[PDB]
């Protein structure tokens, strides 16, 4: 492609050798063969974009390296990208409402975890859709979600990879449940369902860690009891914490990267409405920004 080539060699392309098998740089024989035949099948069908190792290995991992199922998942994704306009969302969609409604559903990226992943924060427990729907719609909240996803893929992950010295394909999510009720949980359920559907089918294998904090007692207790029955890959990725989550977060995120309100030392200018409207991280550092240029605001 010659633009993509330049871009792909501008950040580290191998995962650390202790990552899960089937990740870039960690391929078994016939995990290399499955990658090759998936590519030629997508080429024979006329696809020319997003045929890099990282991308195709995510679709393969999501289908246990069943090549035909991974191909069908990829084709389904490209069809959604065309119907939804995803390839041009960064230029077409403008979430001008965000300063008005961010406080009614706080969502923000902030710095990185110890593995180099960008950290994504979601204060779901504070959600107030009754006030949000005075100004925006669920449809526009989802466009904004995909807008941010495209910005993670095009800008944040390449910069995080450079800052980390190795390929970074995934994020660390912190979802704060402080404040949910049964009522507000039902009110946010449709958005969460659509978001999760988009994530799993169109962004497979992008979830690296997922921490729920300030979980209600019954919710946290259910997880405590059934942990022994989750596959050990899942149990190293999902954490359901109650009120005392700070020490657990600090095992995964450097204290100088974790916001103070969650037990860390990272501070933003609260006068510029900083945390809820900030986007601080290696992707805002010129020494980690490559030929793609800096991510938009
Ligand atoms: O799978 C993902 C996910 C999807 C796409 C992308 Br580009 C990233 N990423 O690397 O930032 C993560 N997530 C896990 C589930 N997520 C989620 C789902 C429903 C509601 C709220 C959420 F935060 C979002 C993050």
Swiss-Prot record:
It is a peripheral membrane protein. It catalyses: a 1,2-diacyl-sn-glycero-3-phospho-(1D-myo-inositol)(in) = a 1,2-diacyl-sn-glycero-3-phospho-(1D-myo-inositol)(out); a 1,2-diacyl-sn-glycero-3-phosphocholine(in) = a 1,2-diacyl-sn-glycero-3-phosphocholine(out). GO terms for molecular function: phosphatidylcholine transporter activity; phosphatidylinositol transfer activity. Keywords: Cytoplasm, Golgi apparatus, Isopeptide bond, Membrane, Phosphoprotein, Protein transport, Transport, Ubl conjugation. The keyword Glycoprotein does not apply. It is found in: Golgi apparatus membrane; Cytoplasm. Its main location: Golgi. GO terms for biological process: ascospore formation; Golgi to plasma membrane protein transport; Golgi to vacuole transport; Golgi vesicle budding; negative regulation of phosphatidylcholine biosynthetic process; negative regulation of phosphatidylglycerol biosynthetic process; phosphatidylinositol metabolic process; phospholipid transport. Signal peptide: none annotated. Pfam families: CRAL_TRIO (PF00650), CRAL_TRIO_N (PF03765). SUPFAM superfamilies: CRAL/TRIO domain, CRAL/TRIO N-terminal domain. Present with 84300 molecules/cell in log phase SD medium. Required for transport of secretory proteins from the Golgi complex. Catalyzes the transfer of phosphatidylinositol (PI) and phosphatidylcholine (PC) between membranes in vitro. Essential for viability and secretion. Exchanges its bound phospholipid with phospholipid monomers that reside in membrane bilayers. Regulates specific trans-Golgi export pathways, like transport from endosomes to the trans-Golgi or transport from the plasma membrane to the vacuole at the level of the endosome. This is SEC14 cytosolic factor. It comes from Saccharomyces cerevisiae (strain ATCC 204508 / S288c) (Baker's yeast).
């Amino acid at each position: 492609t010659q633009q993509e080539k330049e871009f792909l060699e501008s950040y580290p392309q191998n995962c650390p050798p202790d990552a899960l098998p089937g990740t870039p740089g960690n391929l078994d024989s016939a995990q290399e063969k499955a990658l090759a035949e998936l590519r030629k099948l997508l080429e024979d069908a006329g696809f020319i974009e997003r045929l890099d190792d990282s991308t195709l290995l995510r679709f393969l991992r999501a289908r246990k390296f069943d090549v035909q199922l991974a191909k069908e998942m990829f084709e389904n994704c490209e069809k959604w990208r065309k119907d939804y306009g995803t390839d041009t969302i960064l230029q077409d969609f403008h979430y001008d409402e965000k300063p008005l409604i961010a406080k009614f559903y706080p969502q923000y990226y902030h710095k990185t975890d110890k593995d180099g992943r960008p950290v994504y924060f979601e204060e779901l427990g504070a959600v107030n859709l009754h006030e949000m729907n005075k100004v925006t719609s669920e449809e526009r909240m989802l466009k904004n979600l995909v807008w941010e996803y495209e910005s993670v893929v095009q800008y944040r992950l390449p910069a995080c990879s450079r800052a980390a010295g190795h390929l970074v394909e995934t994020s660390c999510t912190i979802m704060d449940l402080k404040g949910i009720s049964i009522s507000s949980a039902y009110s946010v359920m449709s958005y969460v369902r659509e978001a999760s559907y988009i994530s799993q089918n169109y962004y497979p294998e992008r979830m690296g860690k997922f921490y729920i904090i300030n979980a209600p007692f019954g919710f946290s207790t259910a997880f405590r009891l059934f942990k022994p029955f989750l596959d050990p890959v899942t149990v190293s990725k999902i954490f359901i914490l109650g009120s005392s989550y700070q020490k657990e977060l600090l095992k995964q995120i450097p204290a100088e990267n974790l916001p103070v309100k969650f037990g860390g030392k990272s501070e933003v200018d609260e006068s510029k409405g900083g945390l809820y409207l900030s986007d601080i991280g290696p992707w805002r550092d010129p020494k980690y920004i490559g030929p793609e240029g800096e991510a938009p605001e």
